[PDB]
Amino acid sequence: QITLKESGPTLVKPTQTLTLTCNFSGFSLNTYGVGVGWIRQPPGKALEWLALIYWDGDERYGPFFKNKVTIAKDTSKNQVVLTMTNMDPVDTATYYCARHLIPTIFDYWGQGTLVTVSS
Amino acid sequence: SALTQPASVSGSPGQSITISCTGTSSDVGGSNYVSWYQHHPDRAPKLLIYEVTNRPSGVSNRFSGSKSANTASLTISGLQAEDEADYYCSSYTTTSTHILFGGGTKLTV
Amino acid sequence: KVSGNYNYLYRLFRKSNLKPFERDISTEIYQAGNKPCNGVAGFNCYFPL
Amino acid sequence: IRGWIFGTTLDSKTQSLLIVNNATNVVIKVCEFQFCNDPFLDHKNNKSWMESEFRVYSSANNCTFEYVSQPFLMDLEGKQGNFKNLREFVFKNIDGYFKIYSKHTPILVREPEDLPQGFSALEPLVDLPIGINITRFQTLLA
Ligand SMILES: *[C@@H]1O[C@H](CO)[C@@H](O)[C@H](O)[C@H]1NC(C)=O
Ligand SMILES: *[C@@H]1O[C@H](CO)[C@@H](O)[C@H](O)[C@H]1NC(C)=O
């Protein structure tokens, strides 16, 4: 069965860039019809969709963060890598990686990791 | 964004109570895809509604939903101690693939 | 797909109606007007699909 | 004569028919085939009959239909004179289907040229359901 696990640094300097990984285990991402996306929720406010990638190498990013984020996949090790740039204290949030389908928008969510900005 | 949702709703255990998520009809479009998730603290949320008045495997029959003209209403019957959580609305939109709903916390006594 | 699917193709322009049960396809350039057309498409040159 | 190979764009991007009759195979293959201006198979020391350069179709894209059938009654080596054997084929195209009728008569009494005046029929050899247009095919003897 599928577990979504997030890994990466929690404290980041604002000038420095951020990298994050989600090591999904339990589905082959190459199956036709399944995607995977990223959702962040800053404390005190609602969630925020980041981006999502498809099985056949089709990538969809957020309307504002096209340059900020980049996504890539590795089905051999069953991992996905996301890169975020020039983050802000408002951007500090809990991050989740999630399976995505068409009928059911989002079904299973990873436990997530906190991200905060300081020195 | 341009989508809203009332945050707090209150009721009494053993009875039925409802909350709604509301937005603009143009952004969500003709096709609804109304969805609702629950989130108690200290672990990740899961899905309880994926289609109009529809619930996947691992059912909880007390759940119910209904899609009005511009809103989606979630109704709960026979409340117990598990209601004290935050419930998020989520619908497909046209100009972007956004939901951006605040979520609905529940109160009971 | 949520962002749309673009890998599906369909022909728009052909010189004449094709006989029943035709399967082969040619991706050569099409010219609408009488102007000779080579290389890239453009004015009076429409991509066949 | 060896076999008939034919497509429409000569570049292995459009599907094509491969008919090969070298020694014992009769292979029919519906696949894209890259064709040439002058593909040759007979040329071999100019006196030795061989299917030299068997590979006249350089590449392919996607193959669908494969069919194996028995060869016909031919002769061996290369020499000139006493052309006893006669062969006759008719190729027809009906709604994609491509039908071939064949007949082979040995020991024709009449001299070279001198088309025989004997009544003969043609039995249905084989039909192949490809479903494309056909106005460009050519035999490849060896
Ligand atoms: C006929 O074709 C088959 C399939 O490639 C091949 O194995 C066989 O050797 C061929 N016959 C010849 C070359 O006489
Ligand atoms: C016969 O043909 C082969 C292949 O074309 C060539 O390598 C060889 O030199 C030729 N030999 C003669 C005697 O023509």
Short mmCIF file of C-alpha atoms and ligand atoms in Angstrom, two decimals:
data_model
loop_
_atom_site.label_atom_id
_atom_site.label_comp_id
_atom_site.label_asym_id
_atom_site.label_seq_id
_atom_site.Cartn_x
_atom_site.Cartn_y
_atom_site.Cartn_z
CA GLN A 1 0.00 0.00 0.00
CA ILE A 2 1.08 3.57 -0.79
CA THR A 3 2.84 5.86 1.67
CA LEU A 4 3.80 9.42 0.74
CA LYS A 5 6.86 10.64 2.64
CA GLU A 6 8.37 14.14 2.56
CA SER A 7 12.05 14.84 3.19
CA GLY A 8 14.06 18.06 3.25
CA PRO A 9 15.47 20.85 5.40
CA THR A 10 13.10 22.65 7.76
CA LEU A 11 15.06 25.87 8.40
CA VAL A 12 16.18 27.89 5.37
CA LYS A 13 17.88 31.26 4.92
CA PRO A 14 15.75 33.53 2.67
CA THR A 15 18.60 34.14 0.21
CA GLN A 16 19.22 30.38 -0.04
CA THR A 17 17.03 28.15 -2.20
CA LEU A 18 14.99 25.16 -1.04
CA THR A 19 14.81 21.55 -2.23
CA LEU A 20 12.26 18.93 -1.20
CA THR A 21 11.68 15.27 -2.00
CA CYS A 22 8.67 12.97 -1.79
CA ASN A 23 9.50 9.26 -1.83
CA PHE A 24 6.18 7.70 -2.76
CA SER A 25 6.15 3.95 -2.15
CA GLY A 26 3.31 1.72 -3.29
CA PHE A 27 2.35 2.77 -6.82
CA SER A 28 4.25 2.82 -10.08
CA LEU A 29 3.88 6.43 -11.21
CA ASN A 30 4.27 5.32 -14.84
CA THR A 31 0.71 3.94 -14.89
CA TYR A 32 -1.44 5.77 -17.43
CA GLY A 33 -3.84 8.17 -15.70
CA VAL A 34 -2.23 9.00 -12.32
CA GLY A 35 -0.47 12.20 -11.26
CA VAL A 36 1.15 13.65 -8.16
CA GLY A 37 1.07 17.19 -6.79
CA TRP A 38 2.23 19.42 -3.94
CA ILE A 39 0.09 21.38 -1.47
CA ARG A 40 1.32 23.83 1.16
CA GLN A 41 -0.60 25.36 4.08
CA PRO A 42 0.86 28.39 5.87
CA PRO A 43 0.01 28.55 9.58
CA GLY A 44 -3.00 30.69 10.40
CA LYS A 45 -4.46 30.55 6.88
CA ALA A 46 -5.78 28.10 4.29
CA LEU A 47 -3.85 25.69 2.05
CA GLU A 48 -2.17 26.58 -1.26
CA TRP A 49 -1.65 24.43 -4.34
CA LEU A 50 1.90 24.42 -5.72
CA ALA A 51 2.12 22.19 -8.80
CA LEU A 52 1.53 18.69 -10.13
CA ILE A 53 3.16 16.32 -12.61
CA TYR A 54 1.59 13.61 -14.77
CA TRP A 55 2.60 10.02 -15.47
CA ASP A 56 3.72 10.70 -19.06
CA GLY A 57 6.02 13.64 -18.29
CA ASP A 58 3.45 16.45 -18.41
CA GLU A 59 4.05 19.16 -15.81
CA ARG A 60 1.61 21.75 -14.48
CA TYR A 61 2.77 24.48 -12.09
CA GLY A 62 1.00 27.19 -10.14
CA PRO A 63 -0.02 30.39 -11.94
CA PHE A 64 2.36 32.49 -9.82
CA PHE A 65 5.27 30.14 -9.06
CA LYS A 66 6.20 28.92 -12.56
CA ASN A 67 9.81 30.10 -12.26
CA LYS A 68 10.02 29.55 -8.50
CA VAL A 69 9.30 25.80 -8.56
CA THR A 70 10.66 23.00 -10.71
CA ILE A 71 9.57 19.36 -10.58
CA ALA A 72 11.16 16.10 -11.67
CA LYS A 73 10.45 12.40 -11.22
CA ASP A 74 12.49 9.20 -10.93
CA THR A 75 10.37 6.05 -11.21
CA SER A 76 13.43 3.80 -10.83
CA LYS A 77 13.76 4.86 -7.19
CA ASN A 78 10.09 5.97 -6.99
CA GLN A 79 10.81 9.57 -5.95
CA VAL A 80 9.82 13.10 -6.94
CA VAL A 81 11.95 16.23 -6.42
CA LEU A 82 10.69 19.82 -6.13
CA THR A 83 12.76 23.01 -6.07
CA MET A 84 11.52 26.29 -4.56
CA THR A 85 13.30 29.65 -4.83
CA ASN A 86 13.47 33.08 -3.14
CA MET A 87 11.00 32.06 -0.44
CA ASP A 88 9.49 34.50 2.06
CA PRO A 89 8.43 34.38 5.72
CA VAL A 90 4.83 34.27 4.47
CA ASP A 91 5.85 31.26 2.36
CA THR A 92 6.64 29.30 5.54
CA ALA A 93 4.15 26.44 5.58
CA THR A 94 3.45 22.76 6.07
CA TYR A 95 4.08 20.88 2.81
CA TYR A 96 2.31 17.76 1.54
CA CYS A 97 2.82 15.53 -1.49
CA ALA A 98 -0.33 13.88 -2.80
CA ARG A 99 -1.58 11.43 -5.41
CA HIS A 100 -3.90 13.03 -7.97
CA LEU A 101 -6.66 11.52 -10.10
CA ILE A 102 -9.31 13.03 -12.37
CA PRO A 103 -12.56 11.75 -10.72
CA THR A 104 -11.16 12.01 -7.18
CA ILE A 105 -9.07 15.19 -7.21
CA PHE A 106 -6.80 14.23 -4.31
CA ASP A 107 -7.09 10.94 -2.42
CA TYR A 108 -4.07 10.15 -0.21
CA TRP A 109 -1.88 12.82 1.39
CA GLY A 110 1.58 12.49 2.87
CA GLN A 111 2.20 13.47 6.47
CA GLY A 112 4.08 16.60 5.40
CA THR A 113 6.98 18.66 6.71
CA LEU A 114 7.15 22.11 8.29
CA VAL A 115 9.14 24.81 6.51
CA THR A 116 10.23 28.03 8.23
CA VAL A 117 12.50 30.90 7.19
CA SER A 118 15.15 32.33 9.53
CA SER A 119 18.92 32.65 9.92
CA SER B 1 -8.14 33.82 -3.96
CA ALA B 2 -11.74 34.42 -5.07
CA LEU B 3 -13.12 31.40 -3.17
CA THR B 4 -14.47 31.56 0.38
CA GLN B 5 -15.79 29.25 3.10
CA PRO B 6 -17.27 29.89 6.57
CA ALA B 7 -14.83 28.71 9.21
CA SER B 8 -16.83 27.86 12.34
CA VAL B 9 -20.06 25.89 12.77
CA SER B 10 -21.64 24.73 16.03
CA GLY B 11 -24.27 22.22 17.10
CA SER B 12 -25.14 19.49 19.59
CA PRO B 13 -24.08 15.83 19.77
CA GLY B 14 -26.55 13.27 18.49
CA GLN B 15 -28.29 15.72 16.13
CA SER B 16 -27.53 16.85 12.57
CA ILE B 17 -25.63 19.99 11.58
CA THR B 18 -24.44 21.38 8.26
CA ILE B 19 -21.81 23.72 6.83
CA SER B 20 -21.30 25.11 3.34
CA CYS B 21 -18.53 26.25 1.01
CA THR B 22 -19.42 29.07 -1.38
CA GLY B 23 -17.76 30.81 -4.32
CA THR B 24 -18.54 32.10 -7.80
CA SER B 25 -20.31 29.96 -10.40
CA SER B 26 -18.18 31.23 -13.29
CA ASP B 27 -14.84 30.10 -11.84
CA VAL B 28 -16.02 26.65 -10.75
CA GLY B 29 -17.83 26.21 -14.06
CA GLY B 30 -20.80 24.12 -15.06
CA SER B 31 -19.10 20.87 -14.01
CA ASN B 32 -18.87 20.78 -10.23
CA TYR B 33 -16.56 18.02 -8.94
CA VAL B 34 -17.43 18.97 -5.37
CA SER B 35 -15.07 17.38 -2.84
CA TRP B 36 -14.74 17.50 0.94
CA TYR B 37 -11.91 16.45 3.26
CA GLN B 38 -11.65 16.12 7.03
CA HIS B 39 -8.64 16.96 9.19
CA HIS B 40 -8.25 16.26 12.87
CA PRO B 41 -4.96 17.62 14.23
CA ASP B 42 -1.65 15.72 14.25
CA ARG B 43 -2.05 13.69 11.03
CA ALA B 44 -2.76 14.23 7.36
CA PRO B 45 -6.29 14.82 6.02
CA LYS B 46 -8.19 12.23 3.99
CA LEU B 47 -11.12 12.38 1.57
CA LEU B 48 -14.75 11.95 2.61
CA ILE B 49 -16.52 13.37 -0.48
CA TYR B 50 -15.19 13.05 -4.04
CA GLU B 51 -18.39 13.40 -6.11
CA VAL B 52 -21.87 14.82 -5.63
CA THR B 53 -23.24 13.11 -2.50
CA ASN B 54 -20.66 10.36 -2.92
CA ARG B 55 -18.26 8.67 -0.50
CA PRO B 56 -15.48 6.17 -1.33
CA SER B 57 -14.61 2.87 0.36
CA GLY B 58 -14.25 3.07 4.11
CA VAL B 59 -17.69 4.56 4.48
CA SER B 60 -19.27 6.60 7.29
CA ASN B 61 -22.97 6.75 6.43
CA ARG B 62 -23.56 9.75 8.72
CA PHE B 63 -21.79 11.87 6.09
CA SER B 64 -23.88 13.61 3.45
CA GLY B 65 -23.45 16.29 0.82
CA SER B 66 -25.50 18.36 -1.59
CA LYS B 67 -24.47 20.74 -4.38
CA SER B 68 -26.61 23.88 -4.64
CA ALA B 69 -26.41 26.55 -7.34
CA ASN B 70 -23.16 28.15 -6.13
CA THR B 71 -22.48 26.29 -2.87
CA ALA B 72 -21.64 22.82 -1.59
CA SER B 73 -23.25 21.76 1.70
CA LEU B 74 -21.90 19.07 4.03
CA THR B 75 -24.30 17.62 6.60
CA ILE B 76 -23.53 15.35 9.56
CA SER B 77 -25.99 13.21 11.52
CA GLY B 78 -25.55 11.64 14.94
CA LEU B 79 -22.60 13.71 16.15
CA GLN B 80 -19.95 12.28 18.48
CA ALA B 81 -16.55 13.38 19.78
CA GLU B 82 -14.87 13.04 16.36
CA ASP B 83 -16.50 16.17 14.89
CA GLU B 84 -14.06 18.61 16.55
CA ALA B 85 -11.90 19.01 13.45
CA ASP B 86 -11.48 21.19 10.36
CA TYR B 87 -13.28 20.24 7.14
CA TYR B 88 -12.04 21.56 3.80
CA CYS B 89 -14.03 22.17 0.63
CA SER B 90 -12.38 21.61 -2.75
CA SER B 91 -13.77 22.15 -6.25
CA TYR B 92 -12.25 22.33 -9.72
CA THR B 93 -11.94 25.80 -11.24
CA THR B 94 -11.46 27.10 -14.79
CA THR B 95 -8.75 29.79 -14.90
CA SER B 96 -6.56 27.82 -12.48
CA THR B 97 -6.52 24.43 -10.76
CA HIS B 98 -7.08 26.08 -7.38
CA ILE B 99 -9.33 25.41 -4.41
CA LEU B 100 -7.91 27.73 -1.72
CA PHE B 101 -10.69 27.12 0.81
CA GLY B 102 -10.15 28.05 4.44
CA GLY B 103 -11.88 24.95 5.77
CA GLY B 104 -14.64 24.49 8.30
CA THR B 105 -14.00 23.83 11.98
CA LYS B 106 -16.80 22.25 14.00
CA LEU B 107 -18.07 22.93 17.51
CA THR B 108 -20.22 20.79 19.79
CA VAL B 109 -21.20 20.43 23.44
CA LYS C 1 -6.29 15.88 -18.06
CA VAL C 2 -6.74 18.80 -15.68
CA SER C 3 -4.31 20.92 -17.67
CA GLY C 4 -5.61 19.50 -20.94
CA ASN C 5 -4.44 16.83 -23.37
CA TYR C 6 -2.63 17.81 -26.57
CA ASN C 7 -1.15 14.53 -27.86
CA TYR C 8 -4.24 13.76 -29.98
CA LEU C 9 -4.22 14.86 -33.62
CA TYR C 10 -6.80 15.11 -36.40
CA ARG C 11 -6.50 16.06 -40.06
CA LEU C 12 -8.22 19.24 -41.28
CA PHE C 13 -7.00 19.75 -44.85
CA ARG C 14 -6.85 17.31 -47.76
CA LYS C 15 -6.92 17.77 -51.51
CA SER C 16 -9.99 15.55 -51.96
CA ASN C 17 -12.37 13.28 -50.09
CA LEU C 18 -10.71 9.94 -49.40
CA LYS C 19 -12.06 6.54 -50.37
CA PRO C 20 -13.68 4.41 -47.64
CA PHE C 21 -11.37 2.57 -45.23
CA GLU C 22 -8.17 4.60 -45.61
CA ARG C 23 -5.54 4.22 -42.89
CA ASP C 24 -2.24 5.68 -44.13
CA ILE C 25 -1.33 9.27 -43.26
CA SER C 26 1.19 11.69 -44.76
CA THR C 27 2.50 14.68 -42.79
CA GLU C 28 3.67 16.73 -45.78
CA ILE C 29 2.99 20.46 -45.89
CA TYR C 30 -0.33 21.69 -47.30
CA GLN C 31 -0.85 24.81 -49.42
CA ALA C 32 -4.31 26.37 -49.55
CA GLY C 33 -3.78 29.09 -52.16
CA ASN C 34 -2.17 28.82 -55.57
CA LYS C 35 1.11 30.21 -54.20
CA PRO C 36 3.82 27.51 -54.18
CA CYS C 37 4.78 26.62 -50.62
CA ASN C 38 7.91 24.96 -49.25
CA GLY C 39 9.81 24.80 -45.97
CA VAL C 40 7.64 26.34 -43.26
CA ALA C 41 3.92 27.09 -43.40
CA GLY C 42 2.28 30.51 -43.18
CA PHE C 43 0.12 32.52 -45.57
CA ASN C 44 -2.04 30.10 -47.60
CA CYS C 45 0.00 27.28 -46.00
CA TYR C 46 -1.85 25.41 -43.24
CA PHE C 47 -0.50 22.49 -41.25
CA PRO C 48 -2.51 19.38 -42.24
CA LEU C 49 -3.34 18.43 -38.63
CA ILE D 1 11.50 -12.33 -60.30
CA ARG D 2 11.81 -12.40 -56.45
CA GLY D 3 9.19 -10.37 -54.49
CA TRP D 4 7.07 -7.15 -54.39
CA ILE D 5 7.82 -4.37 -51.80
CA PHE D 6 5.66 -1.19 -51.81
CA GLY D 7 4.66 1.91 -49.79
CA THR D 8 3.66 5.52 -50.45
CA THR D 9 6.30 7.93 -49.07
CA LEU D 10 9.51 5.83 -49.20
CA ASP D 11 10.66 7.01 -45.75
CA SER D 12 9.54 4.38 -43.16
CA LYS D 13 6.97 6.82 -41.75
CA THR D 14 4.00 5.45 -43.73
CA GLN D 15 2.93 1.82 -43.59
CA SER D 16 3.82 -0.46 -46.48
CA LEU D 17 3.59 -4.04 -47.72
CA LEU D 18 6.56 -6.45 -47.69
CA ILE D 19 6.21 -9.59 -49.91
CA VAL D 20 9.39 -11.77 -49.98
CA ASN D 21 9.84 -14.99 -52.04
CA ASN D 22 13.59 -15.82 -51.81
CA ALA D 23 13.84 -19.61 -51.31
CA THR D 24 11.23 -21.03 -48.90
CA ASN D 25 9.54 -18.15 -47.05
CA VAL D 26 6.57 -16.19 -48.32
CA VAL D 27 6.41 -13.44 -45.71
CA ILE D 28 3.79 -10.68 -45.73
CA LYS D 29 4.48 -7.75 -43.40
CA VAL D 30 2.44 -4.56 -42.99
CA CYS D 31 4.98 -2.11 -41.58
CA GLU D 32 6.53 1.24 -42.43
CA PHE D 33 9.40 0.85 -44.90
CA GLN D 34 12.06 3.31 -46.05
CA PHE D 35 12.36 2.94 -49.82
CA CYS D 36 15.03 4.05 -52.28
CA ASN D 37 15.32 5.36 -55.82
CA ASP D 38 16.94 2.15 -57.13
CA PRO D 39 16.71 -0.74 -54.59
CA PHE D 40 18.36 -3.84 -56.20
CA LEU D 41 18.61 -7.54 -55.18
CA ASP D 42 19.61 -9.47 -58.36
CA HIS D 43 23.07 -7.84 -58.78
CA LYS D 44 25.62 -10.52 -57.73
CA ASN D 45 28.99 -11.05 -59.54
CA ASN D 46 26.81 -10.38 -62.68
CA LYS D 47 26.67 -14.14 -63.34
CA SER D 48 25.60 -15.68 -60.00
CA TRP D 49 21.87 -15.47 -59.18
CA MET D 50 21.65 -14.34 -55.51
CA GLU D 51 19.32 -12.03 -53.48
CA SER D 52 22.34 -9.76 -52.76
CA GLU D 53 21.54 -6.70 -50.55
CA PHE D 54 18.51 -8.48 -49.04
CA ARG D 55 18.07 -5.28 -46.98
CA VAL D 56 16.65 -2.73 -49.42
CA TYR D 57 14.19 -1.33 -46.83
CA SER D 58 16.45 0.50 -44.39
CA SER D 59 14.14 1.18 -41.43
CA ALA D 60 10.63 0.77 -40.01
CA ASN D 61 8.23 2.46 -37.60
CA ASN D 62 5.35 0.17 -36.53
CA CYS D 63 4.53 -3.32 -37.82
CA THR D 64 1.01 -4.75 -37.63
CA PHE D 65 0.33 -7.73 -39.94
CA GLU D 66 2.54 -10.80 -40.40
CA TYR D 67 1.72 -13.84 -42.54
CA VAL D 68 3.85 -16.82 -43.61
CA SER D 69 2.95 -19.00 -46.60
CA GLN D 70 4.58 -21.58 -48.85
CA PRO D 71 6.67 -20.65 -51.92
CA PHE D 72 6.01 -21.59 -55.56
CA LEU D 73 7.63 -23.86 -58.14
CA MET D 74 10.66 -22.08 -59.64
CA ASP D 75 13.98 -23.12 -61.18
CA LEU D 76 17.59 -22.84 -60.02
CA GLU D 77 20.67 -20.98 -61.25
CA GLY D 78 20.73 -18.53 -64.16
CA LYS D 79 20.74 -19.43 -67.85
CA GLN D 80 19.20 -18.28 -71.13
CA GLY D 81 16.97 -20.30 -73.44
CA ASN D 82 14.08 -22.78 -73.59
CA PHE D 83 11.63 -20.67 -71.56
CA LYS D 84 9.13 -23.45 -70.95
CA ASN D 85 7.45 -22.01 -67.87
CA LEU D 86 4.59 -19.51 -67.93
CA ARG D 87 3.16 -17.53 -65.04
CA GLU D 88 0.21 -15.17 -64.96
CA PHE D 89 -1.11 -13.05 -62.11
CA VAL D 90 -3.90 -10.51 -61.73
CA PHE D 91 -3.93 -7.93 -58.93
CA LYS D 92 -7.18 -6.24 -57.90
CA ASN D 93 -8.09 -3.60 -55.31
CA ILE D 94 -11.59 -3.65 -53.79
CA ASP D 95 -12.41 -1.45 -50.76
CA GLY D 96 -8.95 -1.67 -49.23
CA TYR D 97 -8.78 -5.42 -49.79
CA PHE D 98 -6.02 -6.44 -52.21
CA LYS D 99 -6.63 -9.71 -54.04
CA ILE D 100 -4.19 -11.74 -56.14
CA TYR D 101 -5.07 -14.53 -58.58
CA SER D 102 -2.32 -16.74 -59.97
CA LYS D 103 -1.73 -19.47 -62.54
CA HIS D 104 1.41 -21.38 -63.55
CA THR D 105 1.63 -23.55 -66.67
CA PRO D 106 4.81 -25.50 -67.55
CA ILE D 107 6.09 -26.75 -70.91
CA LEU D 108 4.28 -24.22 -73.10
CA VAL D 109 4.48 -25.62 -76.62
CA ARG D 110 4.53 -22.28 -78.44
CA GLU D 111 7.79 -20.44 -79.23
CA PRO D 112 9.08 -17.30 -77.46
CA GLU D 113 6.59 -14.45 -77.75
CA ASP D 114 3.67 -16.21 -79.56
CA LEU D 115 1.18 -15.74 -76.74
CA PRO D 116 -0.55 -19.12 -76.24
CA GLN D 117 -4.11 -19.46 -77.52
CA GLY D 118 -5.19 -21.96 -74.87
CA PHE D 119 -8.05 -21.23 -72.49
CA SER D 120 -7.01 -21.06 -68.84
CA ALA D 121 -8.49 -20.07 -65.49
CA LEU D 122 -7.05 -18.40 -62.39
CA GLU D 123 -7.75 -19.74 -58.89
CA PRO D 124 -7.92 -17.33 -55.92
CA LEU D 125 -4.43 -17.23 -54.40
CA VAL D 126 -4.91 -14.83 -51.48
CA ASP D 127 -6.54 -11.58 -50.35
CA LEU D 128 -4.84 -9.19 -47.93
CA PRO D 129 -6.90 -6.59 -45.94
CA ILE D 130 -4.59 -3.59 -45.54
CA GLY D 131 -7.02 -0.75 -46.27
CA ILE D 132 -4.94 1.92 -48.01
CA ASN D 133 -4.82 3.44 -51.48
CA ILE D 134 -2.67 1.73 -54.10
CA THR D 135 -1.34 3.33 -57.27
CA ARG D 136 2.41 2.82 -56.68
CA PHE D 137 3.91 -0.65 -56.32
CA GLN D 138 6.84 -2.33 -58.13
CA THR D 139 8.36 -5.88 -58.23
CA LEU D 140 11.98 -6.53 -57.07
CA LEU D 141 13.48 -9.47 -59.06
CA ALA D 142 16.72 -11.21 -57.93
C1 LIG E 1 12.84 -16.77 -45.22
O1 LIG E 1 12.55 -15.88 -44.12
C2 LIG E 1 12.85 -16.41 -42.82
C3 LIG E 1 12.44 -15.36 -41.82
O2 LIG E 1 13.38 -14.30 -41.76
C4 LIG E 1 14.33 -16.76 -42.73
O3 LIG E 1 14.59 -17.35 -41.46
C5 LIG E 1 14.70 -17.73 -43.84
O4 LIG E 1 16.10 -18.01 -43.80
C6 LIG E 1 14.32 -17.15 -45.20
N1 LIG E 1 14.64 -18.08 -46.27
C7 LIG E 1 15.74 -17.98 -47.03
C8 LIG E 1 16.65 -16.83 -46.73
O5 LIG E 1 15.98 -18.79 -47.92
C1 LIG E 2 31.08 -10.60 -55.91
O1 LIG E 2 30.21 -9.70 -55.20
C2 LIG E 2 30.66 -9.39 -53.87
C3 LIG E 2 29.59 -8.53 -53.25
O2 LIG E 2 29.18 -7.48 -54.12
C4 LIG E 2 32.02 -8.71 -53.94
O3 LIG E 2 32.48 -8.45 -52.62
C5 LIG E 2 33.01 -9.59 -54.67
O4 LIG E 2 34.25 -8.91 -54.83
C6 LIG E 2 32.47 -9.98 -56.05
N1 LIG E 2 33.38 -10.89 -56.72
C7 LIG E 2 33.53 -10.92 -58.05
C8 LIG E 2 34.51 -11.92 -58.58
O5 LIG E 2 32.90 -10.17 -58.79
#
